[PDB]
Amino acid sequence: PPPPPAPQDVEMKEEAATGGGSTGEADGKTAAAAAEHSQRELDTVTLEDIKEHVKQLEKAVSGKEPRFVLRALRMLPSTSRRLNHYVLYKAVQGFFTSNNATRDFLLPFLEEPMDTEADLQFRPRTGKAASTPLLPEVEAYLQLLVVIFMMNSKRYKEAQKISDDLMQKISTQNRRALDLVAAKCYYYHARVYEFLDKLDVVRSFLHARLRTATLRHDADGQATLLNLLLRNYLHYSLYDQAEKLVSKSVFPEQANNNEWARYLYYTGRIKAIQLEYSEARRTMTNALRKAPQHTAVGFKQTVHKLLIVVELLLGEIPDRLQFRQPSLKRSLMPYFLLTQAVRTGNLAKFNQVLDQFGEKFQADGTYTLIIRLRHNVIKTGVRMISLSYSRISLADIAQKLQLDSPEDAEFIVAKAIRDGVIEASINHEKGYVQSKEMIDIYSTREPQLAFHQRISFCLDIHNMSVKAMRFP
Amino acid sequence: DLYSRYKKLQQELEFLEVQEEYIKDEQKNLKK
Amino acid sequence: ATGMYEQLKGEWNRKSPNLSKCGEELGRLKLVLLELNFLPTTGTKLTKQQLILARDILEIGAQWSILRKDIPSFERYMAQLKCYYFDYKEQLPESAYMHQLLGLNLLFLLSQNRVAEFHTELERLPAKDIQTNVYIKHPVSLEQYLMEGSYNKVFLAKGNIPAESYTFFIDILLDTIRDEIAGCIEKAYEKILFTEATRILFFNTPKKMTDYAKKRGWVLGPNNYYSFASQQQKPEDTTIPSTELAKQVIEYARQLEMIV
Amino acid sequence: EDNWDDDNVEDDFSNQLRAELEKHGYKMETS
Amino acid sequence: LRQYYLSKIEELQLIVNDKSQNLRRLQAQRNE
Amino acid sequence: ITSAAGIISLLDEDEPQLKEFALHKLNAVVNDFWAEISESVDKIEVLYEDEGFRSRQFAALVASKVFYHLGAFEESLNYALGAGDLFNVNDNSEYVETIIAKCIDHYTKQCVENADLPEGEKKPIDQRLEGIVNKMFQRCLDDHKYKQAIGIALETRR
């Protein structure tokens, strides 16, 4: 009896205030494209995942559903009668019995905010009402003989988007929330389609909703639909990466600084798999630092596990565990064991490391490191030599890299220059590889080019800041 | 009434620009 | 199985490069493309097995096309073979006549100086290709050798191919390797002599001596390699974008002076 | 900081190695 | 056909709403 | 879904019976992808370039299929009556829904630019476009609502 009533209060009041203020903002002002309660949906990314998972069988949350699905609200007297009915639909939990809507009363409850003479002028209340059945069901994480019910509720949510496409779409811009809803549902729905085979019908309606946007509206929905396309495009990533790069989808722009990070991660892996490493490293580092708000959120453990993989494919050697965290130090242990081998030149120990932990490397989604990595087993070494010796000979490099034949030792140099690892040139009168130095970085108009972009971005921050201001 | 809805929307759109042009003149001169 | 369904292969038993069968081969292509379906290939597993048969005879048609020295028709036909090897309902049994011919597709992809399509192509076999694919070990390890200094071993392994010859991509590989070497080093080095590029680029003095003597600049033959030097002058002014700089600085004042 | 903060080197062979070189053939016959 | 004549006034109403939201900030600055 | 260039290779195999094969499978390759033909646009332009191709008009449809996503609108603006044909024949579709609004705004801005210069040649209305404009004017008259037609004829100032 102490566990029930306080969730019954705070988890009545947060969403009562959210629904009331969302309807009041979306109708009182027409400029509610980015309302205050939009951040409330950000709270719903983090609230209900730790607030309640099951319907709280000690008479707490099972009564929240039939009250919040009984909404008629014709005018002010019907809404006031709903406020009067709130006391009884509140006390029915704590006094007698919360009704057992045990994982099934979500399908005939679609017409429940149409029963008892309901009018639907606020579409986002129906969007939140279609968002609610995933709270005791897909946020309970069971996935046992239950899949068809979330697919049915998602078809009802699709019918809600058809209602947003056909029934009174007079500049409501509710899709700017609904696509965010089509974020969260179609996350775990994706997990459902992760459990079964390829999501071809999801591919078709994802493309259809991707081109349903842009011409209609464009704010943070097309980015989410693009990313939800591209993740399972990258699942069976066979030849569609050329399609994804020729997919003109750099549009995203504002993405609350979180979705843009994983979009950068996805296109970084696409560009990393196609031998272009130097362009991949900068966008990998950009995606790593874009949203590091919390430590080891799963995303960091994977972008950090791709980052110095592509950096070791480039040739530069950082140590991996320099951000020792609760789930960084012990999760990157064979990662550190592999990155210790590239500084050395032992191939047998590296092969023993790979054969010892090849199952974990296949678990990381990084099958194809080895098919290129042996090239860097020589290449990194010669760049270190090209960093150490400004003028190296032709015969000393044979014993400085244990490359046996002097012609074989002097042939990697005939590739590393051409793709570009070292400025040095070779001449066949001495057999000496020698490089020059750069002094003109500050002497020429190199700093002005970077400074113009920095100045433009910094001064435009002031304009964007002042453009959102005082609202008396 | 959809023709009247379109043209009144087109009327206020090109009329909101003359308010946004006249205020930026007034806010500039009020500094001086 | 609408009307054709012929006897295994029409002409394959004796020496293959003959032009007699090809037209009816073309007719067989007609008798596979307007029958039920070829692109979705959803149901009717007998038509899928007929598509497998057409795939095998189209592999023999690719053999015939490279036997008559035809690259665009062959690349079109292989491309259709790659289209046919995956189905929308993947139920088709693997025919054994790909484990010596898919590596020919990989060798063609390598020999068309394509490395991006190589590495994005290497996702069909997740972990299968390491144990089996013994003839197909050569096209996938040729990428590994290319990123190594095994070039002399590559020209020695030009004739070590285990199962069957299909020598055409091996010679196109030779041509592209010599072309990449010859067009890749002409600006880092300065001079070459008779010994400083024969065993380094060409061979150990091969019949292609004259072929490399007439290829491009830096001609060789009279006891030293001379003529057609290649370097740079690098002229610069660097004060040309100053007017552009003016634009930039005025814009700065522009952002400083329009009322927010 | 544990015991060595970060970085360092794991060659496991440099322990007064110049003194070993001086001991290596008597400093290469005192070159 | 007709739904084109709806969607055009939808876009025009979005532009009108955005400009009317932007004007009130300048009105407040002028008032101050 | 990876045929793409492989099927377009057979779609442009150089044989007249293979051109009959091309017109057979060209309505069979109607899909929502306008990517993976973006690298083969000129290829389908070949199927629009052939005057000896009997189904060039149907080729117009796939010539309008390649640009409906890669941002482009002016190509489908061109391919409305000069290529046109069976695309504008279609009654109800979301694929043509943006196209008809594009053509209506193009027609009204061209009518503005023509009626603003009454003296002399004023870059006159082309012969191949207005065919869809009067078609859906009569469709609007056939939609039983004879109240928007006067507005549409008022916006296109003629």
Side-chain angles (χ1 to χ4, degrees), chain A residues 1-89 91-122 124-238 240-318 322-331 333-402 404-411 413-472, chain B, chain C residues 1-58 60-165 167-192 194-201 203-207 209-219 221-224 227-260, chain D residues 1-2 7 9 14-15 19-21 25 30-31, chain E residues 1-3 5-32, chain F residues 1-33 35-68 70-121 123-145 147-158:
Chain A
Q8 298 170 1
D9 301 332
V10 60
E11 183 178 2
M12 86 159 83
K13 197 41 190 180
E14 58 90 11
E15 85 278 2
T18 312
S22 157
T23 40
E25 278 200 61
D27 271 4
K29 72 183 206 291
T30 59
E36 197 273 308
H37 283 273
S38 308
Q39 272 102 12
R40 272 283 309 120
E41 288 65 82
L42 291 176
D43 287 326
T44 66
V45 202
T46 64
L47 200 135
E48 283 86 2
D49 281 335
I50 58 175
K51 187 71 177 68
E52 49 96 22
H53 304 86
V54 82
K55 64 182 69 69
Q56 285 285 315
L57 287 97
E58 44 183 339
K59 271 85 185 170
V61 181
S62 187
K64 304 276 188 295
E65 289 93 13
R67 175 206 321 118
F68 268 74
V69 84
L70 262 286
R71 297 278 182 265
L73 280 79
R74 171 169 207 186
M75 271 206 112
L76 83 155
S78 189
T79 310
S80 164
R81 294 183 181 277
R82 200 79 28 206
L83 305 197
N84 279 253
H85 297 165
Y86 280 165
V87 162
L88 308 171
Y89 272 178
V92 62
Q93 311 165 342
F95 277 71
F96 324 100
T97 293
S98 294
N99 67 319
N100 211 359
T102 189
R103 208 161 305 281
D104 74 276
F105 296 162
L106 295 174
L107 298 88
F109 279 4
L110 183 63
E111 69 202 352
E112 224 63 35
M114 266 315 191
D115 288 331
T116 73
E117 310 99 20
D119 38 15
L120 295 188
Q121 293 177 335
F122 296 98
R125 81 170 169 200
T126 52
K128 279 288 301 305
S131 81
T132 42
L134 287 199
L135 273 57
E137 159 87 311
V138 175
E139 281 137 70
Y141 295 95
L142 295 174
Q143 314 292 319
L144 189 134
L145 179 128
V146 84
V147 167
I148 39 184
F149 308 104
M150 326 79 77
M151 321 327 288
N152 287 319
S153 60
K154 263 173 281 290
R155 299 320 102 177
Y156 303 150
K157 189 149 44 60
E158 286 187 0
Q160 290 298 316
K161 313 146 189 142
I162 307 164
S163 80
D164 202 7
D165 291 332
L166 267 84
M167 162 215 78
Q168 277 107 37
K169 55 160 204 158
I170 313 295
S171 302
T172 67
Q173 279 79 39
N174 305 151
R175 266 137 71 93
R176 307 301 112 203
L178 264 184
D179 293 325
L180 295 174
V181 178
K184 60 136 195 161
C185 71
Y186 295 142
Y187 294 158
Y188 318 95
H189 182 62
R191 292 171 175 92
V192 160
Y193 281 91
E194 257 205 55
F195 302 146
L196 61 82
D197 308 326
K198 188 210 167 88
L199 62 80
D200 215 337
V201 283
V202 188
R203 297 270 209 239
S204 50
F205 296 105
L206 263 201
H207 293 106
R209 291 262 301 280
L210 188 60
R211 75 190 147 82
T212 298
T214 318
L215 317 100
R216 293 182 183 174
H217 299 315
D218 213 60
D220 210 4
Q222 75 289 349
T224 48
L225 296 179
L226 160 71
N227 273 25
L228 286 162
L229 178 155
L230 196 143
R231 39 154 192 86
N232 219 293
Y233 258 70
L234 193 132
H235 222 84
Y236 325 97
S237 79
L238 203 73
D240 36 7
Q241 304 93 323
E243 173 264 354
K244 298 163 223 195
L245 56 96
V246 82
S247 301
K248 316 315 297 169
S249 34
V250 305
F251 309 58
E253 203 44 65
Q254 309 94 350
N256 265 352
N257 213 98
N258 213 72
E259 191 269 348
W260 183 253
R262 57 194 187 86
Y263 166 62
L264 284 160
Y265 174 71
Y266 281 141
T267 186
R269 185 187 263 124
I270 297 168
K271 208 36 66 174
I273 214 59
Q274 273 144 349
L275 285 91
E276 312 151 84
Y277 302 134
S278 180
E279 207 271 347
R281 181 177 65 83
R282 49 143 296 278
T283 175
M284 262 311 97
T285 315
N286 201 0
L288 169 60
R289 70 173 165 84
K290 190 72 170 198
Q293 292 317 114
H294 316 93
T295 86
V297 175
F299 187 38
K300 306 257 293 157
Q301 333 195 29
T302 326
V303 66
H304 190 81
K305 212 175 291 187
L306 206 65
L307 168 79
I308 68 85
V309 154
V310 313
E311 292 186 4
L312 283 190
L313 285 183
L314 248 177
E316 49 182 357
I317 165 68
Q322 293 177 335
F323 195 38
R324 278 159 269 275
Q325 277 313 110
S327 168
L328 271 278
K329 156 243 201 181
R330 293 182 183 174
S331 51
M333 290 291 308
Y335 211 42
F336 180 79
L337 294 206
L338 188 147
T339 202
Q340 201 80 357
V342 55
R343 262 190 224 171
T344 70
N346 199 356
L347 286 95
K349 191 62 177 176
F350 173 70
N351 289 318
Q352 191 181 15
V353 162
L354 181 84
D355 187 78
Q356 193 80 42
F357 290 142
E359 299 293 324
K360 188 60 184 178
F361 290 151
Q362 286 176 356
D364 292 331
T366 325
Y367 284 31
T368 59
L369 55 95
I370 181 61
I371 205 57
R372 291 193 297 274
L373 199 37
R374 62 193 60 251
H375 163 77
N376 198 49
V377 170
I378 73 169
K379 157 164 82 157
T380 281
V382 175
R383 178 215 62 259
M384 195 171 182
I385 285 142
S386 85
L387 186 45
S388 177
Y389 288 82
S390 174
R391 191 169 185 271
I392 196 79
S393 168
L394 73 172
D396 46 8
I397 197 48
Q399 83 263 6
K400 259 159 178 154
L401 177 63
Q402 58 196 49
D404 311 349
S405 152
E407 220 75 271
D408 208 337
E410 286 264 321
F411 218 169
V413 182
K415 273 184 296 194
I417 294 169
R418 181 177 65 83
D419 41 32
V421 192
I422 168 69
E423 195 253 336
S425 308
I426 294 169
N427 198 6
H428 269 313
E429 293 177 350
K430 51 196 80 64
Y432 291 166
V433 196
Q434 47 177 354
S435 62
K436 308 304 156 280
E437 320 290 296
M438 294 300 293
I439 305 106
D440 282 328
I441 294 169
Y442 196 62
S443 182
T444 71
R445 212 186 41 123
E446 171 62 40
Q448 209 278 334
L449 260 303
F451 268 29
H452 179 90
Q453 329 300 93
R454 254 49 154 277
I455 278 163
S456 59
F457 165 78
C458 281
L459 177 63
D460 218 342
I461 272 159
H462 150 84
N463 236 337
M464 294 300 293
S465 68
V466 169
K467 215 87 140 180
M469 261 285 318
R470 181 171 41 244
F471 300 136
Chain B
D1 45 358
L2 185 63
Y3 190 80
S4 295
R5 287 275 303 282
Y6 175 55
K7 206 48 203 60
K8 219 77 63 193
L9 259 179
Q10 196 132 338
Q11 211 70 268
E12 196 81 11
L13 207 158
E14 94 184 86
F15 185 74
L16 220 42
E17 271 185 83
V18 79
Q19 272 146 307
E20 216 78 48
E21 183 178 2
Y22 132 93
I23 279 299
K24 292 222 252 214
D25 165 85
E26 265 279 68
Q27 186 173 355
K28 154 181 63 206
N29 196 219
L30 250 58
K31 284 153 207 129
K32 286 174 221 164
Chain C
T2 59
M4 183 176 282
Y5 176 77
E6 64 99 16
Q7 56 289 349
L8 189 52
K9 313 200 67 96
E11 170 51 50
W12 182 88
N13 289 337
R14 179 223 70 258
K15 187 52 74 194
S16 273
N18 49 78
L19 280 191
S20 52
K21 183 215 198 192
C22 315
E24 293 177 350
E25 272 297 307
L26 287 158
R28 281 196 220 160
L29 255 188
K30 329 316 200 313
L31 284 169
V32 175
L33 291 163
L34 282 277
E35 269 49 46
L36 194 64
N37 64 34
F38 58 96
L39 280 163
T41 308
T42 302
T44 323
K45 200 62 216 180
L46 295 174
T47 55
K48 311 219 220 209
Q49 208 52 48
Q50 186 173 355
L51 194 148
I52 288 182
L53 177 61
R55 186 251 304 178
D56 297 9
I57 307 167
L58 195 53
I60 191 66
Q63 168 98 33
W64 277 23
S65 71
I66 187 83
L67 273 157
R68 60 214 174 207
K69 298 209 48 86
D70 204 314
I71 171 64
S73 182
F74 160 71
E75 183 178 2
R76 167 166 296 108
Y77 279 138
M78 294 300 293
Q80 259 318 103
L81 291 176
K82 153 130 97 151
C83 291
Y84 274 9
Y85 218 94
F86 85 102
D87 280 348
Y88 265 122
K89 202 263 194 190
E90 263 265 6
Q91 168 52 236
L92 79 184
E94 178 260 346
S95 97
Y97 295 93
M98 294 300 293
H99 280 132
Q100 56 270 67
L101 258 68
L102 207 76
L104 301 168
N105 192 31
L106 290 139
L107 278 168
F108 157 72
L109 275 66
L110 177 63
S111 282
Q112 221 256 341
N113 58 60
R114 283 231 268 274
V115 175
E117 264 62 39
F118 177 80
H119 284 243
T120 198
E121 149 184 30
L122 211 38
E123 213 256 356
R124 192 82 181 170
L125 304 193
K128 164 183 176 183
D129 37 18
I130 315 297
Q131 293 177 335
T132 175
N133 262 15
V134 282
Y135 195 23
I136 321 293
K137 276 324 274 153
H138 169 44
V140 64
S141 56
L142 195 56
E143 143 76 19
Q144 287 210 160
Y145 280 151
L146 295 174
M147 294 300 293
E148 211 205 80
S150 151
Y151 284 81
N152 285 84
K153 200 259 161 176
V154 153
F155 317 138
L156 281 148
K158 202 89 65 202
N160 88 301
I161 61 171
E164 67 72 38
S165 205
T167 307
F168 269 59
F169 313 114
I170 323 293
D171 307 4
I172 296 159
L173 155 79
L174 167 82
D175 201 299
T176 44
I177 279 195
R178 309 255 173 239
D179 180 35
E180 193 267 322
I181 290 294
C184 55
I185 174 62
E186 263 177 49
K187 293 179 179 179
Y189 291 176
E190 198 27 75
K191 219 195 91 47
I192 47 180
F194 211 100
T195 74
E196 304 177 326
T198 293
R199 51 198 43 78
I200 321 290
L201 170 156
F203 177 80
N204 262 296
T205 59
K207 293 179 179 179
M209 183 176 282
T210 84
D211 170 48
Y212 302 136
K214 316 306 155 217
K215 176 198 212 125
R216 293 182 183 174
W218 286 106
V219 283
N223 196 30
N224 194 1
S227 291
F228 212 117
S230 91
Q231 267 321 111
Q232 50 243 49
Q233 293 177 335
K234 203 191 172 293
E236 60 98 354
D237 175 41
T238 299
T239 196
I240 43 151
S242 64
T243 281
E244 162 62 39
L245 290 188
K247 298 187 186 296
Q248 294 192 357
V249 68
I250 294 162
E251 179 292 310
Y252 296 157
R254 197 136 59 245
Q255 294 300 320
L256 205 46
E257 273 317 317
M258 331 290 138
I259 285 97
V260 281
Chain D
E1 199 266 338
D2 189 44
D7 209 326
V9 175
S14 35
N15 37 304
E20 319 308 292
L21 295 174
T30 320
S31 46
Chain E
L1 191 41
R2 141 164 207 276
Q3 154 253 325
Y5 203 24
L6 269 85
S7 41
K8 189 147 293 190
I9 61 171
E10 304 273 4
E11 271 94 64
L12 286 208
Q13 160 74 51
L14 213 162
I15 298 304
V16 159
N17 167 231
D18 164 79
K19 299 296 183 181
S20 184
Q21 194 269 346
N22 186 34
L23 175 134
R24 294 191 294 282
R25 185 180 45 102
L26 265 70
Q27 284 259 5
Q29 264 166 27
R30 206 270 211 162
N31 283 313
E32 298 321 301
Chain F
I1 294 169
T2 60
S3 64
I7 184 59
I8 294 169
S9 63
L10 196 49
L11 185 67
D12 203 17
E13 212 284 290
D14 310 14
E15 179 172 298
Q17 293 177 335
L18 276 281
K19 298 314 167 134
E20 304 319 286
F21 273 37
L23 57 92
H24 151 267
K25 76 183 95 71
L26 202 39
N27 192 31
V29 294
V30 170
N31 258 9
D32 308 347
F33 296 154
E36 286 115 310
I37 319 90
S38 48
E39 322 152 335
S40 313
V41 177
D42 43 342
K43 297 295 300 309
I44 210 65
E45 184 46 59
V46 174
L47 264 175
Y48 186 74
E49 265 313 303
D50 223 22
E51 198 41 83
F53 194 45
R54 293 182 183 174
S55 64
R56 202 171 197 210
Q57 317 313 94
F58 296 97
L61 274 66
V62 64
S64 153
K65 165 207 297 179
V66 46
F67 301 95
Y68 185 63
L70 71 94
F73 256 44
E74 292 313 298
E75 192 266 348
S76 164
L77 181 134
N78 285 348
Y79 285 37
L81 219 63
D85 275 287
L86 177 63
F87 197 12
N88 295 347
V89 156
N90 305 326
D91 206 343
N92 194 7
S93 295
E94 210 272 342
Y95 176 28
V96 61
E97 173 52 49
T98 50
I99 312 299
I100 58 105
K102 174 259 309 161
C103 205
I104 287 307
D105 65 61
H106 189 17
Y107 185 67
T108 191
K109 76 208 190 203
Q110 195 102 321
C111 268
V112 158
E113 96 194 28
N114 281 137
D116 280 20
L117 301 135
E119 284 106 308
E121 168 256 298
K123 185 67 219 63
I125 289 296
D126 309 275
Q127 38 95 50
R128 293 182 183 174
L129 295 174
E130 87 293 335
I132 189 184
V133 166
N134 300 71
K135 238 170 54 185
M136 300 176 187
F137 200 57
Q138 192 48 265
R139 266 210 224 173
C140 159
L141 294 150
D142 289 2
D143 284 352
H144 182 34
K145 28 209 188 205
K147 283 90 193 158
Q148 316 168 94
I150 178 181
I152 274 287
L154 250 193
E155 161 68 37
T156 83
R157 305 160 336 137
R158 40 165 210 81

